[PDB]
Design a protein around this nucleic acid. Sequence first.
RNA 1: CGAGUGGCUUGCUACCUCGAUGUCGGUUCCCUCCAUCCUGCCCGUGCAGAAGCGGGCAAGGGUGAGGUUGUUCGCCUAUUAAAGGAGGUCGUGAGCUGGGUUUAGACCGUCGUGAGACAGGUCGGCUGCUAUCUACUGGGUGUGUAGGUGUCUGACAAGAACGACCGUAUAGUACGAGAGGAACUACGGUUGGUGGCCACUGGUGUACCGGUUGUUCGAGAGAGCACGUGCCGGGUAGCCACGCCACACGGGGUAAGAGCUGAACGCAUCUAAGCUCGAAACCCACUUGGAAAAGAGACACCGCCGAGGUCCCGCGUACAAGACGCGGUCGAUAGACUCGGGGUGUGCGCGUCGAGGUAACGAGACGUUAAGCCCACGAGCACUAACAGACCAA
RNA 2: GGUCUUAAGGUAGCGUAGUACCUUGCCGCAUCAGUAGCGGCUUGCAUGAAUGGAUUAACCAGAGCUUCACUGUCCCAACGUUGGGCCCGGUGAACUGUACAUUCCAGUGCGGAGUCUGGAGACACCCAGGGGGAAGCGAAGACCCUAUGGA
RNA 3: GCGAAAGCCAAGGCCUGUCGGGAGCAACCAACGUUAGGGAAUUCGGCAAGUUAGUCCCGUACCUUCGGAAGAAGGGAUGCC
RNA 4: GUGGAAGUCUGUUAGAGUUGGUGUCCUACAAUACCCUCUCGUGAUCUAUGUGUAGGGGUGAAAGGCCCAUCGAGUCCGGCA
Lengths: 337, 132, 53
Amino acid sequence: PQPSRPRKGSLGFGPRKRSTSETPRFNSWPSDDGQPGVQGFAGYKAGMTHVVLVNDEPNSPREGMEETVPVTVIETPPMRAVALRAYEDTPYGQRPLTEVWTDEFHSELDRTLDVPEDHDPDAAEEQIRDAHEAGDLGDLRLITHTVPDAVPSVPKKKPDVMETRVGGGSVSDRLDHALDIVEDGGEHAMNDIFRAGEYADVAGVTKGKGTQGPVKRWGVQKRKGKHARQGWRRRIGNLGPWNPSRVRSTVPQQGQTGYHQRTELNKRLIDIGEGDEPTVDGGFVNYGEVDGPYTLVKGSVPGPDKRLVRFRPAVRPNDQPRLDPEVRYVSNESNQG
Amino acid sequence: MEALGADVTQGLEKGSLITCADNTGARELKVISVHGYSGTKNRLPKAGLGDKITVSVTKGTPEMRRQVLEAVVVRQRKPIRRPDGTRVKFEDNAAVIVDENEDPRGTELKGPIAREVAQRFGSVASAATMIV
Amino acid sequence: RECDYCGTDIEPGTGTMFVHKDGATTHFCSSKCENNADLGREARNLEWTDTAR
RNA sequence: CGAGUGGCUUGCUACCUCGAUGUCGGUUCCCUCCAUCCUGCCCGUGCAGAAGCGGGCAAGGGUGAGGUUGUUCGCCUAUUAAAGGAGGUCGUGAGCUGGGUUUAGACCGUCGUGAGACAGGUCGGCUGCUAUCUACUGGGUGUGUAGGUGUCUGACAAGAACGACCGUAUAGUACGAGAGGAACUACGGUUGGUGGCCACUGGUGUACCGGUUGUUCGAGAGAGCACGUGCCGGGUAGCCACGCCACACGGGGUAAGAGCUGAACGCAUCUAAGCUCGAAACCCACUUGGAAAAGAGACACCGCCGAGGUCCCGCGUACAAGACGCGGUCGAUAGACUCGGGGUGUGCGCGUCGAGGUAACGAGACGUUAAGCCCACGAGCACUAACAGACCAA
RNA sequence: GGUCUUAAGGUAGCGUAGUACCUUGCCGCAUCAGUAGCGGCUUGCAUGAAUGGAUUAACCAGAGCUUCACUGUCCCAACGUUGGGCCCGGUGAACUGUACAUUCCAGUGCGGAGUCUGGAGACACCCAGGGGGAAGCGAAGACCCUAUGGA
RNA sequence: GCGAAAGCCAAGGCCUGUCGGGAGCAACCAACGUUAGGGAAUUCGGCAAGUUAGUCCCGUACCUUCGGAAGAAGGGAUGCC
RNA sequence: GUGGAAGUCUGUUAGAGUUGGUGUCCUACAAUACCCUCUCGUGAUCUAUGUGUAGGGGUGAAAGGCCCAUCGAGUCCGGCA
Ligand SMILES: [Cl-]
Ligand SMILES: [Cl-]
Ligand SMILES: [K+]
Ligand SMILES: [Mg+2]
Ligand SMILES: [Mg+2]
Ligand SMILES: [Mg+2]
Ligand SMILES: [Mg+2]
Ligand SMILES: [Mg+2]
Ligand SMILES: [Mg+2]
Ligand SMILES: [Mg+2]
Ligand SMILES: [Mg+2]
Ligand SMILES: [Mg+2]
Ligand SMILES: [Mg+2]
Ligand SMILES: [Mg+2]
Ligand SMILES: [Mg+2]
Ligand SMILES: [Mg+2]
Ligand SMILES: [Mg+2]
Ligand SMILES: [Mg+2]
Ligand SMILES: [Mg+2]
Ligand SMILES: [Mg+2]
Ligand SMILES: [Mg+2]
Ligand SMILES: [Mg+2]
Ligand SMILES: [Mg+2]
Ligand SMILES: [Mg+2]
Ligand SMILES: [Mg+2]
Ligand SMILES: [Mg+2]
Ligand SMILES: [Mg+2]
Ligand code: NA
Ligand code: NA
Ligand code: NA
Ligand code: NA
Ligand code: NA
Ligand code: NA
Ligand code: NA
Ligand code: NA
Ligand code: NA
Ligand code: NA
Ligand code: NA
Ligand code: NA
Ligand code: NA
Ligand code: NA
Ligand code: NA
Ligand code: NA
Ligand code: NA
Ligand SMILES: [Sr+2]
Ligand SMILES: [Sr+2]
Ligand SMILES: [Sr+2]
Ligand SMILES: [Sr+2]
Ligand SMILES: [Sr+2]
Ligand SMILES: [Sr+2]
Ligand SMILES: [Sr+2]
Ligand SMILES: [Sr+2]
Ligand SMILES: [Sr+2]
Ligand SMILES: [Sr+2]
Ligand SMILES: [Sr+2]
Ligand SMILES: [Sr+2]
Ligand SMILES: [Sr+2]
Ligand SMILES: [Sr+2]
Ligand SMILES: [Sr+2]
Ligand SMILES: [Sr+2]
Ligand SMILES: [Sr+2]
Ligand SMILES: [Sr+2]
Ligand SMILES: [Sr+2]
Ligand SMILES: [Sr+2]
Ligand SMILES: [Sr+2]
Ligand SMILES: [Sr+2]
Ligand SMILES: [Sr+2]
Ligand SMILES: [Sr+2]
Ligand SMILES: [Sr+2]
Ligand SMILES: [Sr+2]
Ligand SMILES: [Sr+2]
Ligand SMILES: [Sr+2]
Ligand SMILES: [Sr+2]
Ligand SMILES: [Sr+2]
Ligand SMILES: [Sr+2]
Ligand SMILES: [Sr+2]
Ligand SMILES: [Sr+2]
Ligand SMILES: [Sr+2]
Ligand SMILES: [Sr+2]
Ligand SMILES: [Sr+2]
Ligand SMILES: [Sr+2]
Ligand SMILES: [Sr+2]
């Protein structure tokens, strides 16, 4: 009677093409509540290890017991909020109004941008504040970049640039909060934004697999039994009915799989430290050794080792925060074996 | 059902033949269905440690033979994961016949039982000689 | 914990426990050890083993 | 008894097609319909409760596994929230199958004088093609907007990104003589679906290490062949699922429905104007794409004798071409080497022992030896190679 | 019915059969569940004695059914191997072609339209792909009927 | 080795079952290796694949035209010195 | 015990054949091919050459099979435009 069955794969992540920017671009930000603050940070994926944790959950039958938890190690060195961009509200949505830059720039920021030699920070600030008085000011965001140089395992020296929204108290207060950071040199850290135990949304460009067929790319069945020996093994039944006389874009077909941007929600931060406590013996495979600012994210993170990953305070957390989980053990056992 | 306390990779399907670890007179049991389960197109219904299943008696005494009874999976060859990460696996696949109240039909259980199964079915546990 | 087969310590959050028919229990640190055991080899006769060493 | 709607059944007609539009059932894969089987929200009851029974809104999601039979249908079994029905050339053979139907062989029953027939049964019996256009999935090159780098906007577009269930507390409580026996809410888990990841478990791993059979290189050592590993055991990286991680709450507007105020109609009236509420459904929230959005966008800085870019060179977080990303001495980008980290399992040689044997000889054992051999990983290290150098450019 | 047509009126056996329409007959076996299979019953639509009946050890690339063993047939797919596929040098066909042709949704039309109508969408070119459509290509339909056709 | 069997190797013949170069070399296809747990649930039907296997010893049912059934079945052994 | 019969068994010995894969191929290597599986293999056996039977006629352990890629009546030319 032709049993029902959900379709193969989701239609919500298309088209399934190669990502335009290897640097992830958040398409949404946390709501304004607490004091002003940068709503995101970034780092480079190193690898995974596991840790034994004291069950934190107050509703768990195991509260207070040993629990082994998988962890992805991400190197999160200090970044530079190099500029403050203001958006104005218009009939056609938000549009960049102006930017307030700084004087101090990392020695190699010139590998990506044409660093400013002559700029007027006060004229920029002036225009912005006037926009606020006028009541045409849209959110406030900081132009941010990483310092790959601080990460030995990562070959690149060319910084990765991304814009990160600033939310918080009143606009006037966070506008001033924003200007404060920038001016210094923009240097800030993972600590300044996140605390172990909070939930973060991690975004990243997945591992690339080039061209793959329907079975692997969409999860369609392989031909079965006798149907697997006639000359068709990994090809779908048909491209559609007689009518409509065309192939709908919804039928599972071959193509690019991997290297797509993905935003994974509610990833618990198990620990934010610095040094080489998480490093594995022999070194993380295909990566290297960790000995500096790092973050331990519960579970998996999209992307291959060395790819830039971005953090953002969870915009739709399911559970309440249980700060600073107790870590009783961090495996440093070789990952080769 | 009440959380099991461990992750299970179902090692059994509908039609699987397993050991009846008790003294009811049933020696071999065939899995017919899995309580509370619902699969998907073409998927053979699966069962593992802790699941209550409907069974048919394949081997045993004439009186027990062919009767369709309820049972509880107590052991399986496919590994399971405990909170501390360790995997646990048994020498065989076995289940215990149980009544409408989940009380063992037999008087004695044969062989070890997973602690997790014991937590779920206490009366079954209070019949176990070995709980691992 | 130590591997009931080779003798080395079992990295926490690792290994498998095999529950014998009679209820006995054997904690294995790895597949390698499990597999040599399945072959009928006794840890003391295998030089690379802590037990042997 | 009367009035209709549908085009799922069947019949009718002969309008299209006989210089051919390949059958039924199944399968696989995609979209849809609602006359709703479940899930959400309601109304009534011959509604105490629990539960039935009937009705309304509602198509978001789900509707599964098996036994006979080619079967559709249907009968049957255990599960389930439920295991709804229908359209797409009775969707789907330039996709599959070939059981059935439907050639040529043969048999049975019936019919026929016979050849032979049967809208009966039965055994066997063939499935061509290198895609021109269009369509779509992904990937490039150009032109347009109109010197460069970086960052964005968001018209539009896609999503089910989430659906469902069990259990606990509520509570042996409300209700009820009892039997029986709820809910709001807060929790824990399972299942189906979805996206990603490999620390863990599992698979592979014709890298690698070991054992060993036959044969050839005289033996030994070390090797070839026995099919792309002779066979067997283990297994790194990597890739994987059987493994692991993540996938709301809340707003706004409504349907059925519950009501407020309220007249036409002094009263009454949920409705005529107005208003408070109210569905898994609608919009937003969330994810993904998206300056070719022709109103062809915004900001900042750099440059027009030079900003930037190309070729070139060393490479992969990338990859069928193309594209993409990183490094190039202001350097650790690749290789060598040495450590570290891994795999296998104790090398050659020699010495002792060794059932025996006059002796020769001798399978094998122990020691040397955590040995030997090996590594798609890491670090150190400029030793080798990223040199030399050509060119474009407002 | 307790003979009549047309001579006789089915005996031994076998029987729901490769013959039984009814039919998934009824009882039993076996299975969680068996339109199957086997045993029995049997009024046989329409079995039956060399149009041979019954039966049968041995034999069989003959048809159907059951069990033990085993397994990627399946749950549910993964990794690997060799040859292709992809890029480069050389060689170098064929099928097919009224014309135009970037289409999509509806409608209309000899009632099954890329070309008609109305809208919608649509910057050109190229690479790879699996084949939805061109009622795709290949063969003056083999089916059916017709011809004062053939064998 | 039972062997005019397999497999390996001589004498002898050949590199002409005659286009090459390149990409850890993707999808997809041909032919094939290895797959955890379940074990025919797949399918019209175990189709395909697999299981068993050589030799010796023990042992072998119904039925039978007394030939056979029969290698029934089932069990054990197997190298080297 | 001897003996060694058999349209006897196993057997890719030579040699003959072709159950299934509805595998590969299907502008083919090929107008009937390739691979694995499968059957026969002391006889009604297989095989070479010579020789005979001729078209409404042969030949046929019978399938309307075969008689030079064609046979429910060969091929060629003629009747014939
Ligand atoms: Cl299939
Ligand atoms: Cl079931
Ligand atoms: K026709
Ligand atoms: Mg590893
Ligand atoms: Mg390990
Ligand atoms: Mg199915
Ligand atoms: Mg007509
Ligand atoms: Mg056609
Ligand atoms: Mg309705
Ligand atoms: Mg009620
Ligand atoms: Mg829908
Ligand atoms: Mg059809
Ligand atoms: Mg078709
Ligand atoms: Mg066809
Ligand atoms: Mg074709
Ligand atoms: Mg048949
Ligand atoms: Mg005939
Ligand atoms: Mg047939
Ligand atoms: Mg019968
Ligand atoms: Mg007679
Ligand atoms: Mg004709
Ligand atoms: Mg005819
Ligand atoms: Mg005639
Ligand atoms: Mg397996
Ligand atoms: Mg089936
Ligand atoms: Mg077979
Ligand atoms: Mg002759
Ligand atoms: Na084929
Ligand atoms: Na078709
Ligand atoms: Na619905
Ligand atoms: Na059925
Ligand atoms: Na058709
Ligand atoms: Na079909
Ligand atoms: Na076909
Ligand atoms: Na078909
Ligand atoms: Na609402
Ligand atoms: Na007769
Ligand atoms: Na025969
Ligand atoms: Na396989
Ligand atoms: Na097509
Ligand atoms: Na040549
Ligand atoms: Na004699
Ligand atoms: Na054949
Ligand atoms: Na003639
Ligand atoms: Sr961004
Ligand atoms: Sr967006
Ligand atoms: Sr085929
Ligand atoms: Sr059409
Ligand atoms: Sr035609
Ligand atoms: Sr409706
Ligand atoms: Sr309901
Ligand atoms: Sr039909
Ligand atoms: Sr029927
Ligand atoms: Sr269909
Ligand atoms: Sr057939
Ligand atoms: Sr017939
Ligand atoms: Sr029939
Ligand atoms: Sr123009
Ligand atoms: Sr309850
Ligand atoms: Sr009671
Ligand atoms: Sr070889
Ligand atoms: Sr063997
Ligand atoms: Sr209303
Ligand atoms: Sr533009
Ligand atoms: Sr009679
Ligand atoms: Sr006979
Ligand atoms: Sr037009
Ligand atoms: Sr093609
Ligand atoms: Sr030679
Ligand atoms: Sr040549
Ligand atoms: Sr292997
Ligand atoms: Sr079967
Ligand atoms: Sr079946
Ligand atoms: Sr034997
Ligand atoms: Sr013979
Ligand atoms: Sr033979
Ligand atoms: Sr065939
Ligand atoms: Sr085959
Ligand atoms: Sr052919
Ligand atoms: Sr002989
Ligand atoms: Sr001929
Ligand atoms: Sr003529």
